[PDB]
C-alpha cells in the first residue's frame, strides 16, 4: 500500500520536469521570429530536412514512469471502447433484422397483387 | 480509491510527452534556418511516423525488463498482468461481427433490387388501366 | 394494414408532393427540434418508408447535412445516416464528390474539437458512408466515383487526433479494416475493368497505419497483400506502380520474420540510424539486445503477449508437463533458461521443438494458420 505512494512522487517529479522543458522550448520557439517578421517561410528543402529524420531527441533518464505510463493510458481505453462498440453494432444488427421481416413480407403481397391485377387485365 | 489519481495524472503525463516531442522537434527547424517553418501534408507524414515509431519502441522497454522475472510488485506487476491479459475481444466476438453486418447488408440490398423494378413495372399496369 | 403506405404511393405516381413524401420529411424537420416526443418510435416508420424510394432518398441527403442542423441534436442524424445512407444511388453523377468530402470535413471539424471526447460521433458516419460504397461498387457505371471517394476517405481518417497511441478509442481502426476489406473484395472479384491506380492505398496513408499497436488491423493489412498479390502479377512490375508494394512486402517481411531489421536500408523510410541512436539509450544491458528488442510490440510473433498466451495453452492441452517459467519469449530468455537450465531435467516434455527459437516460432506459426480461429496472418516468408 506504500510502493504506489512513492510511485506518485516519482510521477510528479518527471511530469514537472517535462512541463519545464516544454515551457523553455516553447519560449525559445519564437526566438528568431522577432528579427524579421516574415511568418511564411516556404523553403524547408529536402537537402537539409532529410537530416532531421536521422536524429531523435528527448531521451529518458532511468527514473522512468514514462514506461508504465504508456500502457495504462492505452490498454484501458482500447478495452473500454471495444466494450462500447459491441453494444452499438448489436443495436444496429437487431434493428436491421427487425426491418428484414417488415419489408420481406411486402415483396410477397405485391407479387400476388400484380398477379390478380394481370388476371383482371386479361379478362378486361 | 487510489488508481483514478494514477489514471488522470497518467493521461496528463502522456499529453505533455506528446506535445513536447513535437515542439522540441520543430524548434530544430526554427534554429537551423532563419524563419522558414511551413511544411505540407507530403512531408508531415514523414515527420509523424517517426514519432509513432519512437514511442512504439519505448513501449517495448517493459516487456523485456519488467515482465521477465515474475515478481509480485503490487502497483506494477499484478495490474499489468490483469490488464494486459485483456483485449481478448479481438477474435470472433468482434471480428466476424463485421462479417455478419455485411452478410445482413447483402440480403438487405437483394430485397430491394426486387422491389425497385417491381414498382417500376407495376406503374405500367396502372396507367394502362382504363377508366 | 401495412400496404396502404404503398398503394397510396402507387395510386397517382411518384416524384411529386404526394401524401407520404411530405409527411416523412415534415417528421424529420420536427424531430431535430426537441419539442416533439423522442423519435425512437418515429424513425422506424421513417426507415421503413424510406428504404429504396430513390426519388425521395435523393432529398433527405441534400437537406439534413452540412452542420446547418447537426449541432441541434446529433443523436439522431447518426441514426438517419445509418438508415438511408446504406441504400442510395446517384444520378447527378458529377455533383457528389464535391459534396461528401465537404460533408465529412464538416463532420470532422466539429467531431474532435468541442467536448474533447469522440463519443461515437465521427467514425460511425464514416462506417456508414463506407457501407454505402459497397452498394455503389457492386453495380456498374459509377465505380469511378467510388474508388475516387474512397482514397480521400482514408486520407481523412488518418489525421492524428484520432488514430495514435495517446488516445485511440478504436473507432479509427475497425472503420479502417472495413475500408480495406471493401477494396480487397473489389480486388478478388472477377471481370477486371479498372486501372491499377484505384486499388493501392499508397505510402502516405498506409505506411502510418501499418505501424500501429493493435494486432487485428495489422492482420487486415496482411490480408490486403495476401489477396492483392493476385491480379497485380499480370501487370508488368518493371517500375510503374508496383514498386510501392514491393517496398511494403520487403519491410513487412524484414519486420516480422526476417530479423535483419537493424542494419538494413530505410525500412519504413526512417533511415535506420535512428534505430542505432534509439536502442543505445535503454536498459537491461545484457548481451543479446539488438535482435531481441525490436521485433514486435503488442501481439504478433516474438515480442508480444499473444505468442505466450497461445503457447502456454498450446502445451497445457497436449502434454501436461513443466509449465513455462517467465513471460514473453525472446532470442535470449528462452535460450539461456530452457537450454542451460533444463538440459537434462525436463528434456523430453516439450512439443518436439528440438531446436532453439528458429523452430519455436514455426510451431506456433503453423498453429495460427491451420486452425481457423484466431486470425489469418501468414505473410512471413511469402
Numbering used by the authors:
A (entry chain K): 5 to 128
B (entry chain H): 7 to 137
C (entry chain I): 337 to 718
From the paper:
Inner kinetochore proteins, particularly members of the Ctf19c, constitute the foundation of the kinetochore; they both recognize Cse4/CENP-A and recruit microtubule-interacting outer kinetochore proteins. The Ctf3c namesake, Ctf3, is a 733 amino-acid residue protein predicted to consist almost entirely of HEAT repeats (Huntingin, elongation factor 3 (EF3), protein phosphatase 2A (PP2A), and yeast kinase TOR1 repeats). Ctf3 associates with a coiled-coil dimer of Mcm16 and Mcm22 (Mcm16/22).
We now present a cryo-EM structure of the yeast Ctf3c, which resolves the overall organization of the complex, shows how Ctf3 binds Mcm16/22, and clarifies Ctf3c recruitment to the larger Ctf19c. The final map shows side-chain density throughout the particle, enabling modeling at near-atomic resolution. We modeled five Ctf3-C HEAT repeats, which have the overall fold of canonical HEAT arrays. Nearly 120 amino acid residues interrupt an imperfect sixth repeat at the C-terminal end of the modeled peptide chain, making a helical knob. As we saw in the previous Ctf3c model, an Mcm16/22 coiled-coil occupies the cleft formed by the concave surface of the HEAT array. The two main components of the structure, Ctf3-C and Mcm16/22 N, have opposite polarities; the central parts of Mcm16 and Mcm22 form a parallel coiled-coil that begins near the C-terminal end of the modeled Ctf3 polypeptide. The N-terminal parts of Mcm16 and Mcm22, form a set of four interdigitated helices that pack onto the convex side of the C-terminal part of the HEAT array and contact the helical knob. The final model shows that the structure determined here (Ctf3-C-Mcm16/22 N) is essentially the precise complement of the Ctf3-N-Mcm16/22 C crystal structure. Therefore, the Mcm16/22 dimer extends without a major interruption along the Ctf3 HEAT repeats, forming two tightly but flexibly linked structural modules: Ctf3-N-Mcm16/22 C and Ctf3-C-Mcm16/22 N. The new Ctf3c map also enabled unambiguous identification of the Ctf3 residues that contact Iml3 and likely contribute to Ctf3c kinetochore recruitment.
